[PDB]
Amino acid sequence: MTKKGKTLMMFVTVSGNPTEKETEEITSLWQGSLFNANYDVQRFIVGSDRAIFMLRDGSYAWEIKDFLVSQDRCAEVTLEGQMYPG
Structure with missing residues (x-):
């Protein structure tokens, strides 16, 4: 249906294993x-x-998202089905 509230999940991956x-x-x-x-x-x-x-x-x-991807140890940021970078 239609989402309630303004909360939002952000999935982050750290680089370098x-x-x-x-x-x-x-x-x-x-x-x-x-x-x-x-x-x-x-x-x-x-x-x-x-x-x-x-x-x-x-x-x-x-x-x-912009702050996170600007970090050297951030591999990917997943926001609403979209990966960044790029």
């Missing part, structure tokens, strides 16, 4: 940066190199 711990360290600093920019996001680790970012307000998904 990292261990789960390294992925936790890498993504924790990303979450910190987002928070420091007033963004409200929850983080879920779902694999040695996979992370879920749950946005409270999905209307800011583009800004967050």
